[PDB]
Amino acid sequence: IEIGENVLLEYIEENELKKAKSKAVSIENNELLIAYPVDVVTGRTVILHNDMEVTVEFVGKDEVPYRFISRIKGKVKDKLQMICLEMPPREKMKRIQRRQYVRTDAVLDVQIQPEEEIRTLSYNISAGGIAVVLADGLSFQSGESLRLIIRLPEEEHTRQIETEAVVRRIFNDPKSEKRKMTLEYSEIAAGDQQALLQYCIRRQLNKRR
Numbered sequence: 252i253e254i255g256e257n258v259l260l261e262y263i264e265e266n267e268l269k270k271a272k273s274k275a276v277s278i279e280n281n282e283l284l285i286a287y288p289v290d291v292v293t294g295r296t297v298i299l300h301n302d303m304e305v306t307v308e309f310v311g312k313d314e315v316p317y318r319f320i321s322r323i324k325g326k327v328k329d330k331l332q333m334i335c336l337e338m339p340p341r342e343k344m345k346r347i348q349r350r351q352y353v354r355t356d357a358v359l360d361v362q363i364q365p366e367e368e369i370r371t372l373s374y375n376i377s378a379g380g381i382a383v384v385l386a387d388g389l390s391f392q393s394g395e396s397l398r399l400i401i402r403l404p405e406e407e408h409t410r411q412i413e414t415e416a417v418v419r420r421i422f423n424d425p426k427s428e429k430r431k432m433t434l435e436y437s438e439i440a441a442g443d444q445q446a447l448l449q450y451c452i453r454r455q456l457n458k459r460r
Protein backbone atom coordinates (compact mmCIF):
# COMPACT_ATOMS: atom_id res chain seq x y z
CA ILE A 252 0.00 0.00 0.00
CA GLU A 253 0.91 3.68 -0.36
CA ILE A 254 -0.67 7.14 -0.60
CA GLY A 255 -0.28 9.64 -3.42
CA GLU A 256 1.23 6.91 -5.61
CA ASN A 257 -0.07 6.09 -9.07
CA VAL A 258 -2.93 3.59 -9.34
CA LEU A 259 -3.11 2.12 -12.85
CA LEU A 260 -6.51 0.80 -13.95
CA GLU A 261 -7.35 -1.60 -16.78
CA TYR A 262 -11.02 -1.93 -17.75
CA ILE A 263 -13.10 -2.84 -20.81
CA GLU A 264 -15.26 -0.12 -22.37
CA GLU A 265 -17.09 -0.75 -25.66
CA ASN A 266 -15.45 -4.16 -26.18
CA GLU A 267 -11.85 -2.83 -26.22
CA LEU A 268 -9.38 -2.80 -23.34
CA LYS A 269 -8.76 0.75 -22.13
CA LYS A 270 -6.25 1.69 -19.43
CA ALA A 271 -6.18 4.71 -17.15
CA LYS A 272 -3.96 6.27 -14.50
CA SER A 273 -5.35 7.60 -11.22
CA LYS A 274 -3.98 8.66 -7.82
CA ALA A 275 -4.30 6.97 -4.43
CA VAL A 276 -6.20 9.14 -1.93
CA SER A 277 -6.88 6.78 0.99
CA ILE A 278 -7.49 3.13 1.83
CA GLU A 279 -10.00 3.33 4.69
CA ASN A 280 -11.29 -0.07 5.88
CA ASN A 281 -11.67 -2.32 2.78
CA GLU A 282 -12.26 0.55 0.33
CA LEU A 283 -9.68 2.27 -1.87
CA LEU A 284 -10.32 5.85 -3.02
CA ILE A 285 -8.64 7.03 -6.23
CA ALA A 286 -8.81 10.48 -7.80
CA TYR A 287 -8.36 12.05 -11.23
CA PRO A 288 -8.84 9.00 -13.49
CA VAL A 289 -7.00 10.21 -16.58
CA ASP A 290 -6.29 8.11 -19.64
CA VAL A 291 -2.88 6.46 -19.93
CA VAL A 292 -2.15 8.19 -23.26
CA THR A 293 -4.80 10.94 -23.24
CA GLY A 294 -4.08 13.57 -20.60
CA ARG A 295 -7.83 14.25 -20.44
CA THR A 296 -9.90 12.72 -17.65
CA VAL A 297 -12.17 9.70 -18.16
CA ILE A 298 -15.28 8.16 -16.59
CA LEU A 299 -15.36 4.77 -14.85
CA HIS A 300 -18.91 3.42 -15.02
CA ASN A 301 -20.05 2.01 -11.68
CA ASP A 302 -20.04 -1.73 -10.93
CA MET A 303 -17.38 -2.26 -13.62
CA GLU A 304 -14.81 -4.96 -12.89
CA VAL A 305 -11.42 -3.27 -13.25
CA THR A 306 -7.86 -4.57 -12.83
CA VAL A 307 -5.83 -2.41 -10.44
CA GLU A 308 -2.04 -2.15 -10.58
CA PHE A 309 0.20 -0.28 -8.16
CA VAL A 310 3.70 -0.25 -6.68
CA GLY A 311 3.80 -0.70 -2.92
CA LYS A 312 6.19 0.78 -0.40
CA ASP A 313 8.60 -2.11 -1.08
CA GLU A 314 9.20 -1.09 -4.73
CA VAL A 315 7.27 -4.22 -5.73
CA PRO A 316 4.40 -4.14 -8.25
CA TYR A 317 1.02 -5.61 -7.30
CA ARG A 318 -2.06 -6.48 -9.34
CA PHE A 319 -5.59 -7.42 -8.30
CA ILE A 320 -9.05 -7.50 -9.85
CA SER A 321 -11.68 -5.25 -8.29
CA ARG A 322 -14.86 -3.29 -8.98
CA ILE A 323 -16.03 0.32 -9.14
CA LYS A 324 -17.92 0.63 -5.85
CA GLY A 325 -19.13 4.14 -6.64
CA LYS A 326 -18.33 7.82 -6.50
CA VAL A 327 -17.46 9.77 -3.35
CA LYS A 328 -17.99 13.53 -2.95
CA ASP A 329 -16.02 15.52 -0.37
CA LYS A 330 -14.20 18.16 -2.43
CA LEU A 331 -13.71 16.23 -5.67
CA GLN A 332 -15.08 13.17 -7.47
CA MET A 333 -13.10 10.13 -6.32
CA ILE A 334 -13.85 6.52 -7.24
CA CYS A 335 -14.33 3.83 -4.59
CA LEU A 336 -12.52 0.54 -5.30
CA GLU A 337 -13.32 -2.62 -3.37
CA MET A 338 -10.05 -3.89 -1.96
CA PRO A 339 -9.29 -7.63 -2.09
CA PRO A 340 -7.78 -9.58 0.83
CA ARG A 341 -4.04 -9.51 1.36
CA GLU A 342 -3.96 -12.85 -0.33
CA LYS A 343 -5.37 -12.70 -3.88
CA MET A 344 -3.16 -9.61 -4.39
CA LYS A 345 -0.56 -11.16 -6.67
CA ARG A 346 2.91 -9.62 -6.83
CA ILE A 347 3.99 -9.38 -10.46
CA GLN A 348 7.30 -8.98 -12.27
CA ARG A 349 7.40 -7.46 -15.76
CA ARG A 350 11.16 -7.22 -16.43
CA GLN A 351 12.63 -10.05 -18.48
CA TYR A 352 16.18 -9.09 -17.48
CA VAL A 353 17.63 -7.92 -14.18
CA ARG A 354 18.52 -4.23 -14.14
CA THR A 355 21.34 -2.54 -12.23
CA ASP A 356 22.24 1.13 -11.80
CA ALA A 357 25.65 1.41 -13.46
CA VAL A 358 27.42 4.41 -14.99
CA LEU A 359 28.92 2.86 -18.12
CA ASP A 360 30.44 4.38 -21.26
CA VAL A 361 27.86 4.42 -24.06
CA GLN A 362 28.52 5.61 -27.62
CA ILE A 363 25.40 6.41 -29.65
CA GLN A 364 25.72 6.81 -33.41
CA PRO A 365 22.87 6.92 -35.99
CA GLU A 366 25.19 12.53 -37.79
CA GLU A 367 28.38 12.46 -35.71
CA GLU A 368 28.94 10.22 -32.68
CA ILE A 369 27.77 10.86 -29.11
CA ARG A 370 29.86 9.48 -26.24
CA THR A 371 27.74 9.54 -23.08
CA LEU A 372 27.01 7.62 -19.88
CA SER A 373 24.24 5.28 -18.78
CA TYR A 374 22.44 5.51 -15.44
CA ASN A 375 20.93 2.02 -15.38
CA ILE A 376 21.49 -1.04 -17.56
CA SER A 377 19.97 -4.45 -18.28
CA ALA A 378 20.67 -7.41 -20.52
CA GLY A 379 17.70 -6.39 -22.68
CA GLY A 380 17.65 -2.61 -22.41
CA ILE A 381 19.59 0.46 -21.34
CA ALA A 382 18.85 3.93 -19.97
CA VAL A 383 21.19 6.78 -20.87
CA VAL A 384 21.56 10.46 -19.96
CA LEU A 385 21.29 12.85 -22.91
CA ALA A 386 22.83 16.28 -23.30
CA ASP A 387 20.81 19.29 -24.37
CA GLY A 388 20.27 19.68 -28.11
CA LEU A 389 20.29 15.97 -28.94
CA SER A 390 17.14 15.35 -30.98
CA PHE A 391 15.94 11.75 -31.16
CA GLN A 392 12.55 10.06 -31.37
CA SER A 393 10.61 7.23 -29.72
CA GLY A 394 10.95 4.35 -32.17
CA GLU A 395 14.16 5.45 -33.89
CA SER A 396 16.67 2.62 -34.25
CA LEU A 397 20.13 3.58 -32.98
CA ARG A 398 23.47 1.80 -32.86
CA LEU A 399 25.15 2.15 -29.47
CA ILE A 400 28.38 0.67 -28.12
CA ILE A 401 28.59 -0.25 -24.42
CA ARG A 402 31.89 -0.51 -22.54
CA LEU A 403 31.18 -3.34 -20.10
CA PRO A 404 34.04 -3.60 -17.57
CA GLU A 405 33.98 -7.28 -16.64
CA GLU A 406 36.95 -6.86 -14.25
CA GLU A 407 40.37 -6.21 -15.84
CA HIS A 408 39.20 -7.35 -19.28
CA THR A 409 37.11 -4.44 -20.58
CA ARG A 410 34.44 -5.95 -22.83
CA GLN A 411 33.08 -3.78 -25.64
CA ILE A 412 29.45 -4.65 -26.43
CA GLU A 413 28.11 -3.30 -29.73
CA THR A 414 24.34 -3.51 -30.21
CA GLU A 415 21.51 -1.84 -32.07
CA ALA A 416 18.59 -0.58 -30.00
CA VAL A 417 15.30 1.25 -30.54
CA VAL A 418 14.46 4.33 -28.49
CA ARG A 419 11.77 3.52 -25.92
CA ARG A 420 11.13 6.89 -24.30
CA ILE A 421 12.74 10.29 -23.71
CA PHE A 422 11.90 12.38 -20.66
CA ASN A 423 13.25 15.14 -18.43
CA ASP A 424 14.56 14.17 -15.00
CA PRO A 425 12.79 16.38 -12.41
CA LYS A 426 15.89 16.00 -10.19
CA SER A 427 18.49 17.18 -12.73
CA GLU A 428 16.52 18.87 -15.57
CA LYS A 429 18.68 16.76 -17.91
CA ARG A 430 17.27 14.55 -20.64
CA LYS A 431 17.14 10.81 -20.04
CA MET A 432 16.50 8.16 -22.67
CA THR A 433 15.81 4.43 -22.65
CA LEU A 434 16.46 1.88 -25.40
CA GLU A 435 15.71 -1.80 -26.02
CA TYR A 436 18.32 -4.00 -27.72
CA SER A 437 17.15 -4.61 -31.28
CA GLU A 438 20.03 -7.03 -31.90
CA ILE A 439 22.73 -8.18 -29.47
CA ALA A 440 25.20 -11.05 -29.75
CA ALA A 441 24.46 -14.11 -27.63
CA GLY A 442 27.98 -13.99 -26.20
CA ASP A 443 27.81 -10.31 -25.25
CA GLN A 444 24.26 -10.56 -23.91
CA GLN A 445 25.09 -13.48 -21.61
CA ALA A 446 28.11 -11.61 -20.24
CA LEU A 447 25.95 -8.51 -19.79
CA LEU A 448 23.41 -10.73 -18.03
CA GLN A 449 25.86 -12.25 -15.53
CA TYR A 450 27.26 -8.75 -14.97
CA CYS A 451 23.94 -7.27 -13.83
CA ILE A 452 23.22 -10.18 -11.48
CA ARG A 453 26.64 -10.20 -9.79
CA ARG A 454 26.62 -6.40 -9.53
CA GLN A 455 23.17 -6.45 -7.92
CA LEU A 456 24.22 -9.38 -5.72
CA ASN A 457 27.42 -7.59 -4.54
CA LYS A 458 25.37 -5.01 -2.57
CA ARG A 459 23.10 -7.26 -0.48
CA ARG A 460 25.75 -7.40 2.27
Ligand SMILES: Nc1nc2c(ncn2[C@@H]2O[C@@H]3COP(=O)(O)O[C@H]4[C@@H](O)[C@H](n5cnc6c(=O)[nH]c(N)nc65)O[C@@H]4COP(=O)(O)O[C@H]3[C@H]2O)c(=O)[nH]1
Nearest residue numbers: 257309310311313314315316347348349350354380419420
Ligand atom coordinates in the same frame (compact mmCIF):
# COMPACT_ATOMS: atom_id res chain seq x y z
N1 LIG B 1 7.26 2.26 -19.31
C1 LIG B 1 8.31 1.93 -18.51
N2 LIG B 1 8.62 2.76 -17.48
C2 LIG B 1 9.66 2.48 -16.65
C3 LIG B 1 10.44 1.26 -16.88
N3 LIG B 1 11.39 1.23 -15.93
C4 LIG B 1 11.23 2.33 -15.15
N4 LIG B 1 10.19 3.08 -15.59
C5 LIG B 1 9.70 4.34 -15.00
O1 LIG B 1 10.63 4.85 -14.05
C6 LIG B 1 10.06 4.85 -12.74
C7 LIG B 1 11.14 4.49 -11.74
O2 LIG B 1 11.61 3.17 -11.95
P1 LIG B 1 12.76 2.60 -10.98
O3 LIG B 1 13.67 3.75 -10.61
O4 LIG B 1 13.34 1.35 -11.60
O5 LIG B 1 11.89 2.18 -9.69
C8 LIG B 1 10.76 1.34 -9.88
C9 LIG B 1 11.20 -0.09 -9.66
O6 LIG B 1 12.31 -0.11 -8.77
C10 LIG B 1 10.01 -0.76 -9.00
N5 LIG B 1 9.34 -1.61 -10.01
C11 LIG B 1 8.15 -1.36 -10.60
N6 LIG B 1 7.82 -2.34 -11.48
C12 LIG B 1 8.82 -3.25 -11.47
C13 LIG B 1 9.10 -4.52 -12.15
O7 LIG B 1 8.30 -5.00 -12.99
N7 LIG B 1 10.25 -5.15 -11.85
C14 LIG B 1 11.13 -4.66 -10.95
N8 LIG B 1 12.26 -5.36 -10.70
N9 LIG B 1 10.92 -3.50 -10.28
C15 LIG B 1 9.81 -2.76 -10.50
O8 LIG B 1 9.12 0.27 -8.57
C16 LIG B 1 9.67 1.56 -8.84
C17 LIG B 1 8.56 2.50 -9.30
O9 LIG B 1 8.09 2.13 -10.59
P2 LIG B 1 6.95 3.02 -11.29
O10 LIG B 1 6.06 3.61 -10.22
O11 LIG B 1 6.35 2.21 -12.42
O12 LIG B 1 7.84 4.20 -11.94
C18 LIG B 1 8.91 3.85 -12.81
C19 LIG B 1 8.44 3.97 -14.24
O13 LIG B 1 7.48 5.02 -14.34
C20 LIG B 1 10.04 0.41 -18.02
O14 LIG B 1 10.66 -0.64 -18.29
N10 LIG B 1 9.00 0.80 -18.77
Ligand SMILES: Nc1nc2c(ncn2[C@@H]2O[C@@H]3COP(=O)(O)O[C@H]4[C@@H](O)[C@H](n5cnc6c(=O)[nH]c(N)nc65)O[C@@H]4COP(=O)(O)O[C@H]3[C@H]2O)c(=O)[nH]1
Nearest residue numbers: 349350351352354375376377379380381382419433434435
Ligand atom coordinates in the same frame (compact mmCIF):
# COMPACT_ATOMS: atom_id res chain seq x y z
N1 LIG C 1 17.71 -0.53 -18.32
C1 LIG C 1 16.52 -0.04 -18.73
N2 LIG C 1 15.89 -0.65 -19.76
C2 LIG C 1 14.70 -0.21 -20.23
C3 LIG C 1 14.09 0.97 -19.59
N3 LIG C 1 12.93 1.19 -20.24
C4 LIG C 1 12.80 0.24 -21.20
N4 LIG C 1 13.86 -0.59 -21.20
C5 LIG C 1 14.08 -1.75 -22.09
O1 LIG C 1 13.06 -1.79 -23.10
C6 LIG C 1 12.25 -2.96 -22.93
C7 LIG C 1 10.79 -2.60 -23.24
O2 LIG C 1 10.19 -1.83 -22.20
P1 LIG C 1 8.72 -1.21 -22.42
O3 LIG C 1 8.41 -1.20 -23.90
O4 LIG C 1 8.62 0.08 -21.62
O5 LIG C 1 7.78 -2.30 -21.69
C8 LIG C 1 8.01 -2.55 -20.31
C9 LIG C 1 6.83 -2.15 -19.45
O6 LIG C 1 5.63 -2.17 -20.24
C10 LIG C 1 6.79 -3.21 -18.37
N5 LIG C 1 7.59 -2.69 -17.23
C11 LIG C 1 8.76 -3.20 -16.78
N6 LIG C 1 9.25 -2.50 -15.74
C12 LIG C 1 8.38 -1.51 -15.49
C13 LIG C 1 8.29 -0.41 -14.51
O7 LIG C 1 9.18 -0.25 -13.65
N7 LIG C 1 7.22 0.39 -14.57
C14 LIG C 1 6.25 0.24 -15.49
N8 LIG C 1 5.20 1.10 -15.49
N9 LIG C 1 6.27 -0.75 -16.42
C15 LIG C 1 7.29 -1.64 -16.47
O8 LIG C 1 7.44 -4.36 -18.90
C16 LIG C 1 8.24 -4.02 -20.04
C17 LIG C 1 9.69 -4.16 -19.64
O9 LIG C 1 10.31 -5.35 -20.11
P2 LIG C 1 11.90 -5.41 -19.90
O10 LIG C 1 12.31 -6.85 -19.74
O11 LIG C 1 12.25 -4.41 -18.82
O12 LIG C 1 12.42 -4.85 -21.32
C18 LIG C 1 12.50 -3.44 -21.51
C19 LIG C 1 13.91 -2.99 -21.24
O13 LIG C 1 14.80 -4.02 -21.68
C20 LIG C 1 14.83 1.59 -18.48
O14 LIG C 1 14.37 2.60 -17.89
N10 LIG C 1 16.00 1.05 -18.12
